[PDB]
Amino acid sequence: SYTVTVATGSQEHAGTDDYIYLSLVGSAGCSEKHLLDKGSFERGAVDSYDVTVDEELGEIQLVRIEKRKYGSNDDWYLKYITLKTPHGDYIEFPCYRWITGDVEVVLRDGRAKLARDDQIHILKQHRRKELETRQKQYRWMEWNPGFPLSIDAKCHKDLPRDIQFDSEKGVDFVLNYSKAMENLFINRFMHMFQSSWNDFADFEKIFVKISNTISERVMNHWQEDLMFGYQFLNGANPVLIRRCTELPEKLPVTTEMVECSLERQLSLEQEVQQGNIFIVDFELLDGIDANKTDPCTLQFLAAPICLLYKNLANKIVPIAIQLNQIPGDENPIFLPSDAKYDWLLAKIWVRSSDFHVHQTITHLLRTHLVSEVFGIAMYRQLPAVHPIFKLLVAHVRFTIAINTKAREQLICECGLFDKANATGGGGHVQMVQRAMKDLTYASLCFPEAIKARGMESKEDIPYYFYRDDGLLVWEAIRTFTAEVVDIYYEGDQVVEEDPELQDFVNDVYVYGMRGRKSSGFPKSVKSREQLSEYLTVVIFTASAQHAAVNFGQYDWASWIPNAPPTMRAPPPTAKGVVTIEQIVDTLPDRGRSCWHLGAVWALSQFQENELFLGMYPEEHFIEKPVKEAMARFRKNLEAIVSVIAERNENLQLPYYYLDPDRIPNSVAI
Numbered sequence: 001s002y003t004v005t006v007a008t009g010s011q012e013h014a015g016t017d018d019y020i021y022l023s024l025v026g027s028a029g030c031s032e033k034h035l036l037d038k039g040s041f042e043r044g045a046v047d048s049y050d051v052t053v054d055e056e057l058g059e060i061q062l063v064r065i066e067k068r069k070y071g072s073n074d075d076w077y078l079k080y081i082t083l084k085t086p087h088g089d090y091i092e093f094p095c096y097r098w099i100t101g102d103v104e105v106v107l108r109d110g111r112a113k114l115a116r117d118d119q120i121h122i123l124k125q126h127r128r129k130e131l132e133t134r135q136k137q138y139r140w141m142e143w144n145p146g147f148p149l150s151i152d153a154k155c156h157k158d159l160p161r162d163i164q165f166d167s168e169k170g171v172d173f174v175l176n177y178s179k180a181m182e183n184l185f186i187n188r189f190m191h192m193f194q195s196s197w198n199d200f201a202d203f204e205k206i207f208v209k210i211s212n213t214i215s216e217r218v219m220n221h222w223q224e225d226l227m228f229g230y231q232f233l234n235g236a237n238p239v240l241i242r243r244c245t246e247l248p249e250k251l252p253v254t255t256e257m258v259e260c261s262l263e264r265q266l267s268l269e270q271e272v273q274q275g276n277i278f279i280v281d282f283e284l285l286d287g288i289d290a291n292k293t294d295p296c297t298l299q300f301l302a303a304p305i306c307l308l309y310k311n312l313a314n315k316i317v318p319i320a321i322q323l324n325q326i327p328g329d330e331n332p333i334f335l336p337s338d339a340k341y342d343w344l345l346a347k348i349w350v351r352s353s354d355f356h357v358h359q360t361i362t363h364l365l366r367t368h369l370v371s372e373v374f375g376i377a378m379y380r381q382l383p384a385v386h387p388i389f390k391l392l393v394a395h396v397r398f399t400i401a402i403n404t405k406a407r408e409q410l411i412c413e414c415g416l417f418d419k420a421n422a423t424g425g426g427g428h429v430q431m432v433q434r435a436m437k438d439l440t441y442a443s444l445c446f447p448e449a450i451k452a453r454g455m456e457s458k459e460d461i462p463y464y465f466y467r468d469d470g471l472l473v474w475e476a477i478r479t480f481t482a483e484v485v486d487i488y489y490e491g492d493q494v495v496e497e498d499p500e501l502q503d504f505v506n507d508v509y510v511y512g513m514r515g516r517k518s519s520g521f522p523k524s525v526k527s528r529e530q531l532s533e534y535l536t537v538v539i540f541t542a543s544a545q546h547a548a549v550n551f552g553q554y555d556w557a558s559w560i561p562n563a564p565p566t567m568r569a570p571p572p573t574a575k576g577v578v579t580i581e582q583i584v585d586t587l588p589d590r591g592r593s594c595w596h597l598g599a600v601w602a603l604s605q606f607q608e609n610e611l612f613l614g615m616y617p618e619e620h621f622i623e624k625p626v627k628e629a630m631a632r633f634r635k636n637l638e639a640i641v642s643v644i645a646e647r648n649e650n651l652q653l654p655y656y657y658l659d660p661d662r663i664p665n666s667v668a669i
């Protein structure tokens, strides 16, 4: 007799009352269909049955599951099935899928296999038919012109059940944003799009009720040059600043203009040569359409150039700001020596520009859309039994779902994104298109990305915590993927000859990245080392990178003056005119402020049962060597947690974002 154990998921709607039939596919043969229990498989339940067979089957190759309607359709989430055979063998069959009753589900045992491992028809047939089904199920589509290709579905409910959120409205922008505004006691402002705050105190009264540790600090110090500069290294969008190797001709700033800022008795030009000058250049925003979806509110964008300076205390501070790209009499170079509110407003404009690039490029394009490309390629080209599928499936969990929700509710035409954002209404689509033209594989390789911006020296630039922690997590993942690769690939030739791996890599290149020559993405992978790097790009982007740029949004943007989602007047074209009252009226109205707060709060939340880096409750892998690799991965992450903990004890303002205990496995929000 076989002992057959069936485990139902613990999600809300995991249970089913329908009929479940099970049969066993063996070498010598097959078993008859067996109806199970005629009862209910409740959520969280494990059901085991005693099954005697009418024939000796030999070694079990596959388990088939079939769900038939009893009443109405009732989704069933199947975690796994295990067998205890007459011969005393214990076999596990990982599933972790929604069974809708539409189709039969056929499972391999959990041992990871390359195509070259399968030689008998039973297995080859199953493998090929699985991929045929996958490629009918998961298809590419161009959502907007020039975008990376994404899933062929126009709304969340159109997705295959297997890649939907566990609930339909569980993670939902419309609902989550509105609940957020309720929790922040700002519900009453949700429509006040024509009302400015009376003054900073007016917003402050609203804000102190809902501030956390960091945003309260921002409230108290946002006007300081030190805190302005700090954010380029350790804020929510610490990926733009680079070391200037020569002053741009489009920024005609002189030593005499910034002499008061310089502390080494050197000319500006010589400070550049010493590597003490840094720059943030928002040329990408130049020519982007401003939000016009509200005809009663004019909104405005800039494209600033910010020149920064590493002072004697090794802090990077702003010394000059030109708010538009082309120099001229109506495009002043503002300085910390200007009138109080001239310099402040200039900084605010830079902060606003930083927020635009963060939301659409750093966050949306470079973590969300990228991760969806890897995910779709994975589903299309890698069967469940493949070791790379088992490795990566955990790191694209809910990614296609959250992205489809966004395209359905947030960033579509007339979506929520259009309410508060100056780039809303088409501008954000333009940014993605233009950034895509310059998106490279190298720029996703963390250590290379840091060096490409000239920010790698810990000696010259000691307070770049995003860099430090990022490098540690990157290496931890690189070590882990390398061990996994070495377990299932005996050499480089085996990697090169893996046809499914090549098709995976090829799908990312041709469809995901549109077959763009300058993308730098591999067309194929032909060594264990190259494969390891590739897998690290996928996992790091999906986990660490997304965490670093996502979960600090409320911390840094909740005090709106430090991250305005829009501006209601053009950049000042002259000095000595701006007043504090004008600034208040330029900042977002109460309405757009409300939606802004709601959004950045909602996006910064962890789920109650969030899965963090290295947590793999879904045992797709069942073999001991890889389990031990995972164990070492976890131990390495713990060591990093301690490193970061000790580093943060000596900081004015702890940088927590890349603490592995706080890094989710995947892009899920």
Ligand SMILES: [Fe+2]
Binding pocket: 363, 368, 546, 550, 667, 668, 669
């Ligand atoms: Fe995100």
